[PDB]
Symmetry: C6
Subunit: 49 residues, 6 copies
Amino acid sequence: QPTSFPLEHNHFGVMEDGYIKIYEYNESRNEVKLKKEYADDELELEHHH
Amino acid sequence: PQPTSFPLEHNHFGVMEDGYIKIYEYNESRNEVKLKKEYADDE
Amino acid sequence: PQPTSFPLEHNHFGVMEDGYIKIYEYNESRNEVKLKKEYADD
Amino acid sequence: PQPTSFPLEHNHFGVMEDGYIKIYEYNESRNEVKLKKEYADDE
Amino acid sequence: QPTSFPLEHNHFGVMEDGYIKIYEYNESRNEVKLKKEYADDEL
Amino acid sequence: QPTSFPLEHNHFGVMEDGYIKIYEYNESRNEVKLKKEYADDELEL
């Protein structure tokens, strides 16, 4: 069920279940870090003021 | 139905899932995601 | 049936869903998504 | 079998579905999509 | 259950059940060909 | 259940079954190589 997309500066995101997860790949250290995690519902809430 | 996504300019991106397309922005400096726009894909 | 999408220039993007190709634009300035064209058979 | 798609230069893009590769072009100015090439699954 | 992604110079990859295939689209010649084929079996 | 995404300098990622693998395609040597592998839970640390 997951889908992924690219972002700037070698970041990328995954959307799986209700959760969006943002990652970074550091080519220099050759490693990835999970940078941020949101439940889509809290995002929806934020958006409906 | 399985979601699909796609990138957009200025660190925005799109997620299309079940009759809806949602556009988000990732702000790298604040390290935040915001939902910016919802769209009913039924035109 | 099972959608897949892809990016295009100037904040346009497209999606393929059961023999149908739909092209859209996101206009960041107006914060609005619009359907721009649709096809099935080329 | 499900589809998967991907971008290319100059507003072209491709779809892979049921063992087939189709490449399309989107002309923003005419607001049109032309299929450009299409391969059965083989080199 | 295919997935694809773009690469530089109009190349693109498709991953199908443990097999990566890299292609190139040559817009000018309107041609696609298989550049490499690889299986997840990694060292 | 697999999804992929592009990165800088001809690298690309494959997300698949809780596992993120990261590759590089050397157009010059015309070859690809796995470079890093992770479990999503590892990253969740």
